Structure 1
Amino acid sequence: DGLWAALTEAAASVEKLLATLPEHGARSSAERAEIAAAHDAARALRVRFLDTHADAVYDRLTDHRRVHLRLAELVEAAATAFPGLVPTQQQLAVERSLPQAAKEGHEIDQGIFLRAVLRSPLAGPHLLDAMLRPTPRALELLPEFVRTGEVEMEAVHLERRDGVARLTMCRDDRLNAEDGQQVDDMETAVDLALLDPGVRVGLLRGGVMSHPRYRGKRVFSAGINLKYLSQGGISLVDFLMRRELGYIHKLVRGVLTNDDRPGWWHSPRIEKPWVAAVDGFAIGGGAQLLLVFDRVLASSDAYFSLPGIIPGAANLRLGRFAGPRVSRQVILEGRRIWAKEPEARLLVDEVVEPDELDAAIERSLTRLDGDAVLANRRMLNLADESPDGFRAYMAEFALMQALRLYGHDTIDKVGRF
């Protein structure tokens, strides 16, 4: 074999250089090139190790796929069971203390790991199941939500009413800019919507904003928090990967429950229909979310765009809504689509004047009640987007996005917001 020894040698060289070399920004060109070459040799061996050893690695961490571990638990457990394969909780904490410009990019190693795991036909689907399971926070808060029909969190306010899970994204100060906490709240709320039997349809809408330019106006989403991204606060695993494998994937496929209810033989997952209402605009990750709903509404004055990193799974899904030409226009060339122009119908079902929007939203929530809708949305999603398709994409996404997170051009532009 030999690859684990060569890997351990390469990581030792890296930690040796990092101990002796000056800090990032005080290095010479000769020094910057030595450390970059050490990183390259190490990461190349991380790829080579896992190309053949991914299944054995995952089996050790998961008891031969006997234990469902979420992403955070998986990468952490991997660090202690396989030192140098992926960064430790400590190494990540130092990285997090730095601005993106000065980081060493240890997260790329996690990109390598998650790619190899997701590439495995055995480990891949198992991890995707793990991430479809209900979050512990939701299991914690479910009884109180069943009893009060209301949960207020930092970035999301959830309310059960008329059998509708009303998610209202309410970061009034920042146009619902996304961060790791928003993902924790979004995933938690989606779980509660799905596990609450008194909920039949979900609704996602942005709350009223307080910033002076938008005071009194609802706004759906302005995309990722670019400030946090620049400052080093956007986690590859706990944000970029967690949202795609967690709440967004649960909107499509539902929550994977225990075999603790009748039907589970035919429906191991609880899934429900989802309605989105776009006020103001849906930018970035907010626009990405629209590719996953069963009904999308938007006010006449709204627009959709995907504005340098990969826009989540938009590269996976936009082509099926809009074809290869328009999707390159939106993604590669930053085309912005307005609610009232014809091609918005590729993304939006109804466009209504703001004075008629509230009632139009209500009418849509009554139209998705059947068990027939549940059977139909499952067969539709299955045909639109296959398990292999999603897994194949997200595997490669783990590395490509990891690299884009640390590119010199990305770090530069994100620091200019």
Structure 2
Amino acid sequence: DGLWAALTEAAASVEKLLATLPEHGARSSAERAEIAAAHDAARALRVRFLDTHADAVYDRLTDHRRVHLRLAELVEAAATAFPGLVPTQQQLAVERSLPQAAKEGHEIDQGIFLRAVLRSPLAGPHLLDAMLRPTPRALELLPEFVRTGEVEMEAVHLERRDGVARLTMCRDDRLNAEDGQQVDDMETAVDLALLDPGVRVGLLRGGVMSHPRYRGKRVFSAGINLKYLSQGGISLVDFLMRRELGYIHKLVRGVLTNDDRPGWWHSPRIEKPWVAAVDGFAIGGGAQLLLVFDRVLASSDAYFSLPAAKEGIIPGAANLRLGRFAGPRVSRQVILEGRRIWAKEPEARLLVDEVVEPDELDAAIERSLTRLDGDAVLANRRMLNLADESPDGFRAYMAEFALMQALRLYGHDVIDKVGRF
């Protein structure tokens, strides 16, 4: 062994250099290379330690796979139980108060950690189940939602109507640009939709925009908030990983419930079909969402892009899912070269089921919702999703993604590009 002691020392060297060296941006090139080498030695040992000890580390935190912990709770418990393995809440607060260009990149350690956890065939599936459980916030709001049929959240408006959970993304000043709060609202709303027995089908649509160039027009998504990303407010764990393992995965697989109802022995998760309706455009994170719906409609003037081909972060699980929809040539055109796909071109039918003129779209959305009601759709979409995306495939991708995306979140090309927005 000896890896823990080596890691502890290498982390100490890093903290000693951060204490003595000048602040980021005031460092000379020799000072910059010295701290960079210390970060590298420490992170190298984080990997080597977890290569052999990940399962034991995870077992301590979750009582040998007997307590389900979500991502935030997991990395926070790992910080206190294994100092130096991942950053503390206090170290993260310091990072979070800095712009991305000035951060030391302590989230990378969380990427290292979550990679090793998701790579384990024992710990990985367990963490994924934990993220499929209902959020506490949703369980809290569920009784009022059952009664009222309505919840107004900061980034999402949810309404039960005619057996449909109508999620409207309503950040009318910024084209529904995504942030940590949008993810929390989306997961809460998705949780409510799935837990509400009066909901049979879900609908995701963008609301009416108010920014002057789009006033009176609906817009689906302009993707991640690039301003916040530049400013330090995009969290690796609480945004980039949370959305993939939480609400987006619940759209596919449903919510894992307790053994508290009949039939749980054949359906431990409650899943329902989802419809997406795209107004204006779906960009980045919003386009990623479309790879997970049972039905996708778009207005005739809409387009779909994952535009950050030169200097962007990985487009979530698009790299996992797009090849299945579009094949390897088109997926590389979209992701490697930033090809934008328009709702009216033939290849839009790889991503969209129905393209409709603006004046006929509302009615076409309503028709689509009535077609997905039965028990037959539920069984069939479960079998399809199982065939389309294996547990191992999703897990193995999200394991590498945790580290690869962490690195991209701190890449100089990304920081530079995002600052110019």
Give the alignment's TM-score, normalised by structure 1. 1.00
State the Cα distance separating 1:103 from its structure 2 match: 0.2
Q: CA deviation at 1:387?
A: 0.1
Pairwise CA distance, 1:85: 0.1
SS in 2 for 1:304: strand
CA distance in 1, matches of 2:273, 2:412: 41
Distance 1:189 1:407 in 2: 33
Note the C-alpha offset of 1:57.
Answer: 0.1
Deviation at 1:318, TM superposition (A): 0.0
Match of 1:356 in 2: 360
Is 2:252 aligned against 1:252?
A: yes
- Where does residue 211 of structure 2 map in the other structure? 211
How far off its partner does 1:150 sit? 0.1
Structure 1 residue 339: Cα displacement:
0.1
Large movers: runs of 4+ above 2 Å:
none
Query: What does residue 101 of structure 2 align with?
Result: 101
2:43 alignment partner in structure 1: 43
Paired positions, count = 417
CA distance in 2, matches of 1:355, 1:249: 33
Q: Give the Cα separation in 2 of the matches to 1:315 and 1:186.
A: 22
Deviations 1:79-99 (A, max 9, x none): 000000000000000000000
Give per-residue Cα distances to partners, 1:346-367, cap 9 Å, x unaligned: 0000000000000000000000
Deviation (angstroms), 1:373: 0.4
1:12 CA displacement: 0.2
1:377 deviates by: 0.2
Distance in 1, matches of 2:413 and 2:365, equals 41
List gaps (5 residues or longer) in structure 1.
none
Give the Cα separation in 2 of the matches to 1:44 and 1:128: 26
1:281 Cα deviation after fit: 0.2
Report Cα offsets for 1:275-321 as digits up to 9, x if no partner: 00000000000000000000000000000000211000000000000
- Cα distance in 1 for residues equivalent to 2:376 and 2:123: 33
Alpha-carbon displacement from aligned partner over 1:34-93 (angstroms, at most 9, x marks no partner): 000000000000000000000000000000000000000000000000000000000000
Partners in 2 of 1:168 and 1:251 — Cα distance?
Answer: 16
Cα distance in 1 between the residues matched to 2:40 and 2:285: 31
Cα distance, 1:154 vs structure 2: 0.3
Q: CA separation in 2, counterparts of 1:377 and 1:263?
A: 18
Q: CA offsets, 1:193-234, max 9 Å, x none?
A: 000000000000000000000000000000000000000100
| 3-state SS in 1 of match to 2:296 | strand
Q: Using the alignment, how far apart are the partners of 1:41 and 1:30 within structure 2?
A: 17
3-state SS of paired residue (2:265): coil
Shift of 1:131: 0.1
Flag structure 2 segments of 5+ consecutive residues without an equivalent: none
CA offsets per residue over residues 10-36 of structure 1, 9 Å max, x none? 000000000000000000000000000
Task: Quote how far apart the aligned CAs of 1:253 are.
Answer: 0.2
Identical counterparts, % of pairs: 100
Alpha-carbon distance between aligned partners in 1 of 2:171 and 2:409, rounded to the nearest angstrom: 24
Report the 3-state secondary structure (helix = DSSP H, G, I; strand = E; otherwise coil) of the residue aligned with 1:277.
strand
Structure 2 CA distance for aligned equivalents of residues 280 and 386 of structure 1: 33
Tell me, yes or no, if structure 1 residue 126 matches structure 2 residue 130: no
CA distance in 2, matches of 1:414, 1:111: 21
CA offsets, 1:115-173, max 9 Å, x none?
00000000000000000000000000000000000000000000000000000000000
Aligned equivalents of 2:287, 2:265: Cα separation in 1: 35
Deviation at 1:342, TM superposition (A): 0.1
